[PDB]
Paper text:
Hetero-tetrameric Pol epsilon plays a key role in replisome maturation and origin activation. Pol2 is the catalytic subunit, with the N-terminal half containing DNA synthesis/exonuclease functions. The C-terminal half of Pol2 (C-Pol2) has been predicted to contain a second polymerase fold, which has become inactivated during evolution, and is followed by a zinc-finger appendix. Notably, the catalytic domain of Pol epsilon is dispensable for viability (though cells are sick), while the non-catalytic C-Pol2 is essential.
To understand the role of the essential Pol epsilon modules during DNA replication, we studied the structure of a truncation mutant of the yeast tetrameric complex, lacking the dispensable, flexibly tethered N-terminal catalytic domain of Pol2 (hereafter, deltacat). To mitigate this problem, we incubated our preparation with 0.01% of crosslinking agent glutaraldehyde for one minute on ice, before cryo-grid making. We determined a 3D structure of the deltacat core based on 161,372 particles, to an average resolution of 4.45 Å (4.3 Å in the core and 5 Å in the periphery), revealing a compact assembly of dimensions 100 × 90 × 60 Å. To interpret the map, we have docked a recently published structure of human C-terminal Dpb2 bound to the Pol2 C-terminal zinc-finger appendix, providing an unambiguous fit. Docking of a Pol1-based homology model of C-Pol2 into the cryo-EM density required splitting the polymerase into three domains, which were used in independent rigid-body fitting and subsequent real-space refinement. The resulting structure shows a polymerase fold with jaws spread wide open. In agreement with the notion that certain elements are only flexibly tethered to the deltacat core, no density was retrieved for the N-terminal domain of Dpb2, nor for the histone-like subunits Dpb3-Dpb4. For example, the C-terminus of Dpb2 intimately contacts C-Pol2, explaining why a truncation of the last six amino acids in Dpb2 prevents Dpb2 binding to Pol2-Dpb3-Dpb4 and results in a lethal phenotype. Likewise, a so-called ZnF1 element in the Pol2 zinc-finger appendix emerges as the organizing center of the deltacat core, explaining why cysteine-to-alanine single amino acid changes in this region can alter the essential non-catalytic Pol epsilon core, hence abolishing cellular growth. Furthermore, inspecting a more complete Pol2 structure that extends beyond the conserved polymerase module revealed that the C-terminal zinc-finger appendix occludes the DNA-binding groove in the dead polymerase fold.
Residue numbers in the entry: 170 to 194, 207 to 233, 266 to 367, 378 to 402, 405 to 490, 502 to 556, 598 to 665, 667 to 688
Amino acid sequence: FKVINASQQQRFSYNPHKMQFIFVPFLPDIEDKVQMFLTRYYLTNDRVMRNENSITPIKNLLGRDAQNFLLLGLLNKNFKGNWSLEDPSGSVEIDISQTIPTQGHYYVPGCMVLVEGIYYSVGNKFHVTSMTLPPGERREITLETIGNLDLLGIRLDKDLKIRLHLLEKELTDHKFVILNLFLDDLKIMTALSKILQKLNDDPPTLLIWQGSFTSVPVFASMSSRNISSSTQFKNNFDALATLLSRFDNLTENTTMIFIPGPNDLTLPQDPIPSAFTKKINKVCKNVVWSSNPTRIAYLSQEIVIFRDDLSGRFKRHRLEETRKLVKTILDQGHLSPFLDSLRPISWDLDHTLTLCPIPSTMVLCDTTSAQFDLTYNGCKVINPGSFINRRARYMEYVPSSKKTIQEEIY
């Protein structure tokens, strides 16, 4: 039972002939960039093969001139209306002129989909019957076909220990606390005062401090107050550490986790530096600084935490709600199904963002949708929503019974 370090995690590469991963383990390489999407295509390929209306490459159809296939590819774009599609065997412009597809989750670019139709080589523009997304299977059969290795950290698989589930179903002593959170307002101080008031009595176990610790970003340019974004943020930490030290009931038996948001000093992202967490590391002894995103090494489960604006980007890019969002992220099996010219993902840690296999719980702290918790093929996906303008609301999750309770003060 630990917290997985993204900068210190392993790496696994897939082989289609052996259908398995190899012992892979500063700046990345070119091969990483190429094999990034290559690994994506072959992973989706094998994922399709696990589900056994046929299979055909682009070169097979372009070699002909007549027809009739459900092609696989990325909804990319070269020119206006020149929505091209690419597999590792050729490129082809596709059109959806007067198409009545299904009611998919959220069709977005940079996504590998399946479209049926005919070529019509006179203009060589493939037509679409219906656009569909690659289906995602349950975690049971998924973990059945992964093989016999370790994908979370313990190397083979030995999860046949009923004592794990029994002790978790009995030791209710380990509770998770989830609260956007700024630091330079009296309202924040008040909220934290009543929150810790609820926390000094009942000892929690794992604190999850969300991102966006400041209303403003970095890149300071005015030395009016003889300060900068760094110094201001440092003093904000000092104030938080002082309120934290006002009540020493905490850190006695509760572990904490910081998570950097989008406005602190491009994915993935290393945590808040030690130079700004010096005093809190001195006062406390149960601190950690995980990258965004990260995974909690839970003894029998795969919980992943990722804070970003998911709903705020899908609506600004569809061609022509909450379950649509969750359905999209789980079916594509990836956290950022977006082009690299849109969200620059670091070449080294693309595997970290990969949802191979299906995780147990994805903590998606959205900053533009309400708080919820729903199920979709088993993985209970949550959202705590905002924290201040929603009249001070927060969440508490039970891992054993998987209970989800909301707690509001106003």
